[PDB]
Amino acid sequence: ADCGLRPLFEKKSLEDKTERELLESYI
Amino acid sequence: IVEGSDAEIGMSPWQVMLFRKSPQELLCGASLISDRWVLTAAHCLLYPPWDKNFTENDLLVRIGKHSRTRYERNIEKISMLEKIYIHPRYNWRENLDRDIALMKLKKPVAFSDYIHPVCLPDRETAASLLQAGYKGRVTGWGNLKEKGQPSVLQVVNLPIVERPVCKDSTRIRITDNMFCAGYKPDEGKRGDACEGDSGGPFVMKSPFNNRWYQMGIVSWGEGCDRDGKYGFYTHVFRLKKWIQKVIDQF
Amino acid sequence: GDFEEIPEEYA
Ligand SMILES: N=C(N)Nc1ccc(C[C@H](NC(=O)CSc2ccc(Cl)cc2)C(N)=O)cc1
Numbered sequence: 001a002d003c004g005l006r007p008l009f010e011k012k013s014l015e016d017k018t019e020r021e022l023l024e025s026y027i
Numbered sequence: 028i029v030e031g032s033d034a035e036i037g038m039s040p041w042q043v044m045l046f047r048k049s050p051q052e053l054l055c056g057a058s059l060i061s062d063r064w065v066l067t068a069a070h071c072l073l074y075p076p077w078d079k080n081f082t083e084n085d086l087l088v089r090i091g092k093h094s095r096t097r098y099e100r101n102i103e104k105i106s107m108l109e110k111i112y113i114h115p116r117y118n119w120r121e122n123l124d125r126d127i128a129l130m131k132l133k134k135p136v137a138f139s140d141y142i143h144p145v146c147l148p149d150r151e152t153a154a155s156l157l158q159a160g161y162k163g164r165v166t167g168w169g170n171l172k173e174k175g176q177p178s179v180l181q182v183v184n185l186p187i188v189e190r191p192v193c194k195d196s197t198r199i200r201i202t203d204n205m206f207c208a209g210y211k212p213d214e215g216k217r218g219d220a221c222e223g224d225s226g227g228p229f230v231m232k233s234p235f236n237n238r239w240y241q242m243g244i245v246s247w248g249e250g251c252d253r254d255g256k257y258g259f260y261t262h263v264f265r266l267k268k269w270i271q272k273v274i275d276q277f
Numbered sequence: 278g279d280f281e282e283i284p285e286e287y288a
Contacts (some may be wrong), residue, residue, distance in 0.1 A: 003060075004146035004238030007139070008037030013164075016038050019232055021184050025162040026234050048288060051280050087287055098281045105287040232283075 029172045029252035030217040039166045041145035044089040055165045056227025057159040062135035067226035069117040069128040069193040085107040091141035103225030128245040153264035159189040169223025173269045207257035254256035
């Protein structure tokens with residue numbers, strides 16, 4: 001449903017300080 | 028959490044603190060998976076070798092927290108437990124195999140900017156993200172090492188480690204229901220969960236649908252952030268059938 | 278007394 005979508009981040013299209021580190025590791 | 032950093036506000040809205048009623052203290056971490064269900068590690072509630080066997084009335088769940096010790100008025104929500112469900116094959120006698128437990132809340136918690144559930148992985152998401160090198164995120168209010176306690180929730184990103192390396196790092200028997208994560212000595216970077224972080228979530232953000240999934244539960248480790256050692260996590264997807272069975276039945 | 282007391286409504 002709406003699980004895993006954070007109100008203060010994904011919901012308003014804002015990224016947290018280190019989530020990019022995770023994305024970059026998913027090669 | 029060792030070698031981590033302060034979490035941002037609302038960064039891990041599924042984070043749950045398992046709080047002991049008396050004496051009032053941090054017992055473990057946990058995660059919110061729905062308005063009435065909380066996921067944690069079985070050893071947080073049951074570990075006979077240490078005379079640990081908590082019942083519903085012994086603890087409370089605190090949701091929406093950031094500060095470790097302060098009562099966050101108008102932000103956090105405290106819930107009582109209706110029932111605890113420990114995996115019937117949880118191996119507390121040996122290696123903590125199947126280290127998983129569910130807690131049903133007496134009343135549904137209201138979601139907010141600070142309280143929101145995490146997703147549980149499907150077979151495909153698990154197969155795609157559970158690969159050596161891929162990083163997950165661990166959060167908790169546990170020890171900063173073998174020192175003191177943090178003022179606020181800590182976070183650290185760690186890479187999943189190859190199974191042979193996990194196995195060769197310890198004398199404990201590793202099973203398919205566990206995976207390990209952490210940096211290798213040659214990688215330089217550090218980080219690990221520590222005392223008090225047990226039961227908390229190891230999450231990954233799917234690059235396919237941009238949703239956060241809980242792939243593991245902080246289970247066990249030998250020391251914290253030691254070179255050549257790795258933290259071990261309960262493989263959530265491998266135990267999802269049990270999770271679904273419990274929720275469907277109760 | 279490491280933690281701040283919580284409302285009595287949750288002892
Ligand atoms: N508090 C003390 N003075 N000593 C002490 C406390 C706990 C243990 C149990 C042992 N845990 C640890 O050594 C560190 S906690 C920990 C738990 C999970 C993960 Cl993924 C990483 C670190 C484990 N088997 O997980 C052993 C000794």
